[PDB]
Amino acid sequence: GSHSMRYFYTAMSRPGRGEPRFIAVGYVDDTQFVRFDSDAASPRTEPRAPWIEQEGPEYWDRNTQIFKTNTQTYRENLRIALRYYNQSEAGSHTWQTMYGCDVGPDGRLLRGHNQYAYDGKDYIALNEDLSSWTAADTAAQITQRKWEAAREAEQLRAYLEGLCVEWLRRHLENGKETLQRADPPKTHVTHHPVSDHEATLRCWALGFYPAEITLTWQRDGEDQTQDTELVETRPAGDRTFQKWAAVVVPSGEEQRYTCHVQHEGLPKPLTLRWEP
Amino acid sequence: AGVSQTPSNKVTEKGKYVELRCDPISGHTALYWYRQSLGQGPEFLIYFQGTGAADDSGLPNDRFFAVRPEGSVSTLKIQRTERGDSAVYLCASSLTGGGELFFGEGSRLTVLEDLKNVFPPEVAVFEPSEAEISHTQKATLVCLATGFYPDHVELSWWVNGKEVHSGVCTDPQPLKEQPALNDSRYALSSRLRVSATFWQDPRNHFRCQVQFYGLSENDEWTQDRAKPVTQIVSAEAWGR
Amino acid sequence: DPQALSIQEGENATMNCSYKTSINNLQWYRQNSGRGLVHLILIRSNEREKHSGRLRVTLDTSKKSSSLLITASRAADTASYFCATDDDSARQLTFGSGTQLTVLPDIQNPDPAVYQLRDSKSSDKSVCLFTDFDSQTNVSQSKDSDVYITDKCVLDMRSMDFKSNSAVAWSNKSDFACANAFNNSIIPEDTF
């Protein structure tokens, strides 16, 4: 169930410095597999996961075409946007776009997203009924009109349900050893006295995949949402993640603090305290 | 009314530089160029998105280059012109990219080995049969446009100083007089039918008008022959 | 390069093409006529089937082939018909070979009738005009230097609802006259 292919697009002006610039990255779930960067010597689509390096040239040539196209349409949209908002040519602005497709346990398209931001704010976004849009402001509302006329939600829906999903699967079969494995965390709890009066412990999840996890310091077996601290899941740098969670407490109150960690490759949501 | 391409016809020889214009619909960001030749699909050339190419994989070679400075009007530049390049070059416009393409009428460009054999047509109104005005009581006139080259012609009839498409037929394509090779002089005809009441009423007026496309002031005259510019060759008849 | 279709007026034309390319986002049908431009209707890779006006388009993405069907085909509908596919949702349209459609009239009152026509001004060419023949009549290729023939053509007198086929015969020779002109084409026998 619930696999997905997502692309992430970023393009920006650089008045005073140089030509707009366009960058794209594709993931399958939480594994990035492809990249493209406008500023390259001769921009080309390059791999990022081992398992895609297996496609023949037609794949590279084709996506390199689509990105060279996607390069120019953004140079262009950058410019159109300076028109819809009365913006000067001398300030740099940015476009960001995510689109992707989720597939069922069976593999049909479960959900599909396409989402535009200008300058950090939402711009235009396609709705769950892959036909309509939510337009952030008046500018996006021109776009919305422009796109209803070109029936450009239907073009979108044709891709999602066809080219993406077809490829979503074509990959998953090539990199199944990578992409259909769930790596459960290697978890450890650590001992840190900030004083005799008060001492903190730390729930450690290391080298896990995918990036989804829950580290909950259960006091007496309860969440303690307001007194605990946690860092956002971070990347290891191989294709794996790590998160930690800590809490400050009076000493000798150790064992009643159990750490609940749930993760996709975990049969039992593991509860753990730890001492020497 | 839409995507105006220009100049509808160009006719030159080997090694010359041709400049095809096209003015697309306002607010259309994508501007495509295609080209097509006798009885084949249009083939892809280049595809602009605003001020620059987003795809130029159609371009057959470095002699081909297009432009669209201000993002609206495009121009197709061909260089070291050759026979090979002879085709209709199609200009289209999309609103956003893909979807519905609005084509311009085109520019028919013929590139020849020499300007030596360019020939305008001879023009001949033929009168109606009485054996027809009896057996059908209607009058058919026939137009023969003879010995012209290349096959860049449009045949328009005019009754009386106004044009009507009605009752008229021309042939789709002209055909070769010496059909042995591709440099052959061309032959195309056209008929128009009226009531015998109309042609018989003597004060009526018939012009077969035939528009050649050949050369213009930017081409040379080393000839003795009347040098074949772009012109109309008409032929008139009246009533009885 | 799927052959020309001739059909009779009022009866239904059906054209097919096939795209080879990986997916298409959509497929288009385009009308291209005389010297003119090119032209439209559109089906997505996720709908089997679509109707506009007299047209019905069909898409089979397993045989990567489609069917345009014209209902109640008219003279106006005579044009070549072209497919376009959007090749990887990547917005360049790819056009196929397509199909020369010729909707010919049913002429109810055939008067197969070869005539001599005399050029105003000169005692110049005899030009034999095969006119008023049945639409099931075909003129064929003349096989000699002197002899060449216009292929059949239709004319429509709007004011008086008349339609008649007509091919043409010229030559500058005296080994040639009317009963000669059409000795290769299958003919209906009438008026010299």
């Binding site: 776009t97 021109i142 422009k146 | 609103l95 990219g97 | -």
Partner: peptide
């Protein structure tokens, strides 16, 4: 493969 985006 990747989507190609509309203008605007």
């Amino acid at each position: 493969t990747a989507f190609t985006i509309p203008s605007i």
